[PDB]
Amino acid sequence: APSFPFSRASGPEPPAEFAKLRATNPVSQVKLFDGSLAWLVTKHKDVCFVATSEKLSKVRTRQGFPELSASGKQAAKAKPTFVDMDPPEHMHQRSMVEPTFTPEAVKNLQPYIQRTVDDLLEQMKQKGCANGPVDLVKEFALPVPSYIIYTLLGVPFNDLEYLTQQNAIRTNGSSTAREASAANQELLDYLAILVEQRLVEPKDDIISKLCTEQVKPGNIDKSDAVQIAFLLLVAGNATMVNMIALGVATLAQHPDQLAQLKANPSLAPQFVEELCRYHTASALAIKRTAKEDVMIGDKLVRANEGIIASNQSANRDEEVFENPDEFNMNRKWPPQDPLGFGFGDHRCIAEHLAKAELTTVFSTLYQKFPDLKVAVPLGKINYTPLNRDVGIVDLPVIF
Numbered sequence: 549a550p551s552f553p554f555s556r557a558s559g560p561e562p563p564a565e566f567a568k569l570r571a572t573n574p575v576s577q578v579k580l581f582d583g584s585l586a587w588l589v590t591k592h593k594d595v596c597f598v599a600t601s602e603k604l605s606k607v608r609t610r611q612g613f614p615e616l617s618a619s620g621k622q623a624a625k626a627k628p629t630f631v632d633m634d635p636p637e638h639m640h641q642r643s644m645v646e647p648t649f650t651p652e653a654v655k656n657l658q659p660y661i662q663r664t665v666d667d668l669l670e671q672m673k674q675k676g677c678a679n680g681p682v683d684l685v686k687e688f689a690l691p692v693p694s695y696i697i698y699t700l701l702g703v704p705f706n707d708l709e710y711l712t713q714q715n716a717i718r719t720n721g722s723s724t725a726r727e728a729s730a731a732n733q734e735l736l737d738y739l740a741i742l743v744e745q746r747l748v749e750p751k752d753d754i755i756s757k758l759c760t761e762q763v764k765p766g767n768i769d770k771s772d773a774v775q776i777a778f779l780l781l782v783a784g785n786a787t788m789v790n791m792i793a794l795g796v797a798t799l800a801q802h803p804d805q806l807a808q809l810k811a812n813p814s815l816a817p818q819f820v821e822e823l824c825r826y827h828t829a830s831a832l833a834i835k836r837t838a839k840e841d842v843m844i845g846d847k848l849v850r851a852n853e854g855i856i857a858s859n860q861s862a863n864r865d866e867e868v869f870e871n872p873d874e875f876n877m878n879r880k881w882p883p884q885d886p887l888g889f890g891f892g893d894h895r896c897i898a899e900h901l902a903k904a905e906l907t908t909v910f911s912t913l914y915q916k917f918p919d920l921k922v923a924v925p926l927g928k929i930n931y932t933p934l935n936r937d938v939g940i941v942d943l944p945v946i947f
């Protein structure tokens with residue numbers, strides 16, 4: 549049983565193991581850091597099965613759950629939020645904050661997403677590059693998703709820059725465990741104060757809605773509200789930052805596509821669709837434990853055994869996506885859903901918001917900076933460690 553997670557074949561590529569497994573052993577056992585075993589599912593149809601089967605559980609207190617790291621096993625001890633719940637608890641809590649993320653709500657949020665992007669671009673422009681290239685991640689990819697979610701949660705404008713920096717420290721590879729936990733506790737402390745404040749004088753934000761609709765009636769307590777707000781903040785932020793950076797690098801990598809996008813920003817939506825399929829920046833979030841025996845392919849997964857369903861592999865499944873390893877914004881899409889945001893009840897709560905942010909970014913970036921260019925050989929791009937999810941640490945650009 550090979551050790552898992554696997555390492556990316558190279559900076560921008562997925563682990564080489566998946567293609568081989570999809571062809572010769574689509575459902576196989578892998579070995580986790582603690583020596584335990586787990587079933588790895590690599591085919592699109594099977595990943596969808598795991599994501600929706602009622603015989604599988606997301607509860608991390610179940611023996612057999614596939615924790616992939618030492619830290620993961622520790623976090624599994626904290627009280628759970630909806631990300632780690634099964635029905636009926638799952639939707640009972642998730643529906644408390646879903647309103648803000650509906651397709652309709654996100655459509656109404658579009659002008660705000662656009663002004664946020666426009667302002668950040670203007671700041672990056674007036675920040676010039678006269679004395680050298682700028683780091684597109686720090687100056688743009690990081691603040692876009694950060695300012696948006698923080699603002700949606702209820703954070704005041706003046707605190708955005710500092711809070712964006714602290715949240716980044718949580719996941720920065722350079723941060724020490726101490727600095728990471730310190731930033732973590734700090735954000736939690738800050739949200740606690742926001743909840744106390746909003747309980748007294750509610751405003752138009754997620755935290756206020758939680759306080760008024762759930763804390764006051766007694767449906768959840770203050771700490772619960774804090775944890776839910778924290779989940780929404782930390783869940784997909786770092787992924788959003790990486791997707792934006794990955795998007796720019798990909799366009800640099802494929803001049804033809806960039807030319808087409810520049811000529812027709814209306815293609816932004818399809819570019820984003822292909823990006824979320826091609827670069828599956830969140831590939832280790834579909835995990836379960838079997839509540840009872842379940843058959844998947846030619847394998848029997850016994851009760852209490854763990855399962856990891858790779859949506860990254862599913863997104864390269866040649867049986868669903870023709871020429872899966874080719875980035876093609878003009879790709880002819882199959883009836884099957886790409887799985888960059890998961891599948892089933894747990895499907896990313898912010899999928900529509902995420903796509904709206906990316907679409908806004910790629911329909912505006914090259915309009916503002918037609919000559920935007922990565923100011924370093926593409927082969928030198930600073931990617932996240934190969935043993936981690938795909939992403940980019942920093943990206944020097946000129947425009």
Ligand code: HEM
Nearest residue numbers: 631780783784788830833888889890891894895896898902
């Ligand atoms: C391009 C960026 C993003 C990607 C690629 C992404 C991907 C994912 C994936 C793969 C899952 C697992 C879904 C499943 O269990 O099937 C997920 C869950 C989740 N994401 Fe995201 N996400 C992104 C952005 C966001 C943002 C912006 C937020 C925060 C506002 C967010 C909040 C969450 C939450 C709370 C869950 C858990 C949902 C549940 O279990 O019910 N995501 N995301």
